[PDB]
Design a protein around this nucleic acid. Structure first.
Lengths: 40, 273, 256, 40, 256
RNA sequence: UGUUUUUA
């Protein structure tokens, strides 16, 4: 229950369960599979 | 729930009163086995003997004197008592220690209550409206070195500000590395001839630093801080022999040399009442 | 339908123990020893389960029970560190987990009198005799198959050895809260205590930490018949079971 | 009604009505019945 | 669909070997190592299968390949007698049975020339240099991880070390009948030979008898480029697999 | 039946 009109008044959102480390770990054009030769 | 069943005369080859304690078993022998009994009911749940009730009420664990005074011309603010640090332990006040040490492993969420009370033993015109900062310093975090150091900033450290005379109250989840705290540890940090026995970081709750955030007045005000700990959602394992002899050190099973007998010698022989 | 609960046989690996005067075996906390399950596991390394090469009865060098014997204490797995393949695995691995079948043996005639308390104490943290904050040194807490004789003298950096205070500042009479069995010579010649793995962690270092401690304590003193040798041998036989080792590695060097 | 996000914030659990003294009183391999000879 | 047969990874226990210039692994006699089945078993004792604590790659102290190197010979399981938990089990048990993944390593530039013959010889019974009916002494046939250097001098009671005659009176060129692989520096930097258990008996004493013998023999001599160090390291890495031990017992004492 | 509960 929110006691205020403003969205800024609300509490923190907790956790974004949506992770995707790929955008940082694998920012590659061509797909690279673990096990496959990185370059060929 | 039945406490005592109705039971009449017994002429039987089943002798519930005869056993062998050599087995290490305590046979659940009842009054109904030794006497003629009437039916009675418990009218009792055993609510007060639950470990959450037994271990789960507040107790003083630490008391510390800190002074709000001018910090000019002081080189160590920790040792001048402008701030004091407490390595969090429940093993310093013996009454609570004995209760916890009825068990080997305890897993509980904590609930701390910090009560700061001021005193101006010397000439003072008024009772200053001091605000104490209680700062939780987990291992690795920079322990405060000065009373207004950059550490107190507590950008990531949990910190509480409360008025002296008033109190603070905060919950702390189970912070142990293991699945439970060790009340006893028959081991070492590593295989070393001179390393510490019993003492281990398995029980490093962390540390608590206390300062008065107020600048100085002309008068010295001594603030005695009392930390109270209440265990919640208590789980306990492996019941132990109760502590008999007094303690000597935190985290050690050590007892004094030349300590007094704890078994209460009789007046008269073994036959006396 | 006739038979006996005093006549028992325990076969582990290539080792077999028999007894004809047994008191009902104790299973500490009604929990049999088991391998660590995947839901409690933390270490990702596949555990070495050494089977029958280590899961076997190792008999410990016998003790002499005299009229003036205060008692004896062993630490596990410490006591078995020099025992066959178990000891090797103990030193070659970072992590170890093991239950134990302890079997204590003390036979006498029907003329003998005396009672031993055989008790298993988890996390038997010893007290220093020097008091204060003095530590008990590694060498004294890890004696091996020799164990600690409580009738012996104190040593600098050594533990306190007043059996009355359980070496820890608790009273002897209360040790019965721990999984225990008596060897009452009139009734019993053998105690047996099956110990599961007891720790706050799923697996632990076997070298730096002793999970359980076996104590054999004379309560009722040995009273031998007239003209008899005022001594009885006490033999301790321990078998690891559900033993797991993880993180194989160069052999660990320990003090001494 | 819990006023906080954290489980640690909640009150005590009251009582575990589940007792079993057997694990301490009768930690024996073979079953021992009251009345039966303890050893045979 | 693209990829490579020269790029290989072998993971055994906590050990992993990688190669990027591998020649197709040899599986001696197209037979993978396996545990002994009940229909071939003679010994009634339940075998200890030590799993990943022994079934792992042990790297042997490197050899130096010079222009004048004749070759090197290792005996198994002898070579691994001092290797971790495998060695302990080897000495603590009466009977042992094990297959092996041998991995021989010799890297060089594309300017280097030379060819090693990596060959596994079952029952490599060595010949004495003294001729007649002179026996080869235990100490010389069981060198350990050191192996036998064939470039070395003869020793009294020692084996013959003319690599041309395979130390046994057979010719070098015919060793190719045995499961073998070449390390041809232009093609290959790693040989791999998976050895099953080969014996007339289902299980045998590991101390008195060597089932197989690993020989690494320079055929085409090392020709280094101008100004290079006239040496290459040869590293042998061996992993026991499907290892079984039976008849645990006091540790065996061997000569030396 | 030298039988132990439950209900009028």
């Amino acid at each position: 229950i929110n006691y205020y009109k403003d969205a800024a008044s609300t509490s923190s959102a907790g956790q974004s369960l949506s992770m995707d480390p790929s955008k940082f770990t694998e920012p590659v054009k061509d797909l690279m599979l673990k096990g496959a030769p990185a370059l060929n | 729930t039945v406490a005592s069943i109705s039971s009449g005369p017994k002429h039987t080859q089943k002798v519930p009163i005869l056993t062998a304690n050599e087995t290490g078993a305590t046979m659940p022998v009842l009054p109904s086995d030794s006497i003629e009994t009437r039916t009675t009911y418990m009218h009792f749940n055993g609510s007060e003997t639950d470990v959450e009730c037994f271990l789960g009420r507040a107790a003083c664990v630490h008391v510390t004197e800190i002074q709000n005074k001018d910090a000019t011309g002081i080189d160590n603010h920790r040792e001048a008592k402008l701030f004091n640090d407490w390595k969090i332990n429940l093993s310093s006040l013996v009454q609570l220690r004995k209760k916890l040490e009825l068990f080997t492993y305890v897993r509980f969420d904590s609930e701390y209550t910090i009560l700061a009370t001021a005193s101006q033993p010397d000439s003072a015109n008024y009772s200053s409206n001091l605000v104490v900062q209680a700062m939780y310093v987990p291992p690795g975090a920079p322990n405060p070195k000065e009373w207004d150091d950059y550490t107190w900033q507590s950008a990531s450290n949990p910190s509480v500000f409360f008025k002296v005379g008033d109190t603070s109250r905060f919950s702390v989840p189970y912070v142990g590395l293991a699945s439970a705290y060790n009340c006893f540890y028959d081991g070492y940090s590593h295989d070393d001839a001179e390393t510490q026995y019993g003492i281990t970081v398995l029980n490093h709750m962390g540390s608590m630093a206390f300062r008065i955030v107020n600048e100085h007045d002309e008068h010295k005000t001594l603030v005695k801080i009392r930390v109270y700990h209440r265990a919640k959602h208590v789980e306990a394992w492996i019941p132990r022999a109760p502590r008999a002899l007094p303690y000597t050190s935190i985290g050690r099973t050590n007892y004094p040399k030349n300590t007094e007998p704890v078994i209460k010698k009789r007046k008269g022989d073994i036959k006396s009442y | 339908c006739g038979y006996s609960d005093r006549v028992q046989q325990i076969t582990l690996g290539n080792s077999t123990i028999t007894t004809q005067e047994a008191a009902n075996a104790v299973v500490c906390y009604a929990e049999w020893p088991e391998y660590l399950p995947d839901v409690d596991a933390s270490d990702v390394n596949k555990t070495s389960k050494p089977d029958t090469s280590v899961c076997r009865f190792y008999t410990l060098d016998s003790k002499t029970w005299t009229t003036g014997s205060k008692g004896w204490c062993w630490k596990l797995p410490d006591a078995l560190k020099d025992m066959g393949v178990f000891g090797q695995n103990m030193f070659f691995h970072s992590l170890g987990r093991s239950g134990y079948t302890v079997h204590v043996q003390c036979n006498a005639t029907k003329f003998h009198s005396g009672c031993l308390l055989v008790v298993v104490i988890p996390e038997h943290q010893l007290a220093s005799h020097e008091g204060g904050n003095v530590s008990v040194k590694y060498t004294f807490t890890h004696p091996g198959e020799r164990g600690i004789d409580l009738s012996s003298a104190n040593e600098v950096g050594g533990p306190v050895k007043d059996v009355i205070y359980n070496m820890n500042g608790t009273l002897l009479g209360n040790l019965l809260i721990f999984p225990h069995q008596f060897i009452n010579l009139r009734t019993n010649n053998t105690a047996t205590i099956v110990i599961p793995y007891i720790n706050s962690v799923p697996i632990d270092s076997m070298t730096r930490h002793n999970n359980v401690s076996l104590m054999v304590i004379p309560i009722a003193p040995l009273t031998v018949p007239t003209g008899a040798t005022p001594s009885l041998p006490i033999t301790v036989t321990i078998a690891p079971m559900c033993t797991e080792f993880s993180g194989i590695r160069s052999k660990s060097i320990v003090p001494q």
